[PDB]
């Protein structure tokens, strides 16, 4: 009715949400970073053996794109174990190494036997 | 870079609940806590702004 401000601003108009006639992609893209992709293979060096026996820690080579949360969930589902924490580094050769510590109720040495590490 | 000092003067906004800070050239003899007056009907005193 009246303008108590000297400024004209663009009035807010309705903005509809998209309702595509067709989907631009026929099917959703498959997940290329599933659990089998995230865990490549276990490390079996002298350091990795020390980690298993003394720190309750498995040592894995993992996809460089995987994060700690993804590593943790893959390890749990692949081997049905429980994970206390995960430490990661990227090696000078470009691979990502995961230091997965098991919960105190799991024995890494026992788990390593199931996986075939030892 | 400027020889003259500058005075920081605070006015009330006549249309909004605010304080307006201006930056004047400091006329010689003005002091902090002094009242200055600007407008057609301000009195002829050092530091006032008049037409």
């Amino acid at each position: 009715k009246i303008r108590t401000s000297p400024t004209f601003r663009r009035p807010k108009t309705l903005r509809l949400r998209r309702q595509p006639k067709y989907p631009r992609k026929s099917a959703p893209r498959r997940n290329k970073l599933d659990h089998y992709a995230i865990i490549k293979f276990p490390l079996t060096t002298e350091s990795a053996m020390k980690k298993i026996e003394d720190n309750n820690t498995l040592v894995f080579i993992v996809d460089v794109k995987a994060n700690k949360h993804q590593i943790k969930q893959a390890v749990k589902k692949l081997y049905d174990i429980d994970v206390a924490k995960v430490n990661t580094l990227i090696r000078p050769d470009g691979e990502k190494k995961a230091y997965v510590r098991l919960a105190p109720d799991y024995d890494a040495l026992d788990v390593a036997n199931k996986i075939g590490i030892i | 870079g400027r020889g003259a000092p500058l005075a920081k003067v605070v006015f009330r906004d006549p249309y909004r609940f605010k304080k307006r800070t201006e930056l004047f050239i400091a006329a010689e003899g003005i002091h902090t806590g002094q009242f200055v007056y600007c407008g057609k009907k301000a009195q002829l005193n050092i530091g006032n702004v008049l037409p």
């Binding site: 009246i2 303008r3 108590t4 401000s5 000297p6 400024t7 | 249309y15």
Partner: protein, 233 residues
């Protein structure tokens, strides 16, 4: 009975004093460029000198005439797309088992009719833009002796023909029961337009200063007249 706690608390809106109220600033708003443009174009058409050929379109029928003219024209509207289908289907049934009068619309159709003297009354919108589309029509109708009128709104002529807009429409024939109504309009319309054509085409428009300027001129002159009156006292 009044509660003694209530009281008046007036605000003093002098310079200084209390913050000013929220009054209407409409006059002082900074409008979008497109709003400033169309308003400044309205002012220019007042401020400049408008030639008679363009200024003639500011003279328009009064609402009373424009209502009678539009009620008569409502009886001869072109058939809509829908009801042309029914007429065609009815002819199909009739074939298995005359053109009535209608409005003629479009500046190209009306122009040919005026030149052929086949039009009886020409209605021209006052706000066609570009104006060159019809700027010549009032003078053409006068030359051919076709009564013409100027109506407010190309949208109103648009509604007659079931379209958004129409620059002009024309009566070519009417039913016998409406011949008197057309004659009454033509006589009134002819006096306002065709018989004043000499003064319409010599009558410039615009050339009016802004109110502040006019007021300034009025104040300046009034000083002299008062002094001139006080010259003799």
């Amino acid at each position: 009975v009044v509660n003694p706690l209530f009281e008046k608390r007036p605000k003093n809106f002098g310079i200084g004093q209390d913050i000013q109220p929220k009054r209407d600033l409409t006059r002082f708003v900074k409008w979008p460029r497109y709003i400033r443009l169309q308003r400044q174009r309205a002012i220019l058409y007042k401020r400049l000198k408008v030639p008679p050929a363009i200024n003639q379109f500011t003279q328009v029928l009064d609402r009373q005439t424009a209502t009678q003219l539009l009620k008569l024209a409502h009886k001869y509207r072109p058939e809509t797309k829908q009801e042309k289908k029914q007429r065609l289907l009815a002819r199909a049934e009739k074939k298995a088992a005359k053109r009535p009068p209608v409005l003629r619309a479009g500046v190209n159709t009306v122009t040919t009719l005026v030149e052929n003297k086949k039009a009886q009354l020409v209605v021209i919108a006052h706000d066609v833009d570009p104006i060159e589309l019809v700027v010549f029509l009032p003078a053409l109708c006068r030359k051919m002796g076709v009564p013409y009128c100027i109506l407010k709104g190309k949208a109103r002529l648009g509604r007659l023909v079931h379209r958004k807009t129409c620059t002009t429409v024309a009566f070519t024939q009417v039913n016998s029961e409406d011949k008197g109504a057309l004659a009454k309009l033509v006589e009134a319309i002819r006096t306002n337009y065709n018989d004043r054509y000499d003064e319409i085409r010599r009558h410039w428009g615009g050339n009016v200063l802004g109110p502040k300027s006019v007021a300034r001129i009025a104040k300046l002159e009034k000083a002299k007249a008062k002094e001139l009156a006080t010259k003799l006292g």
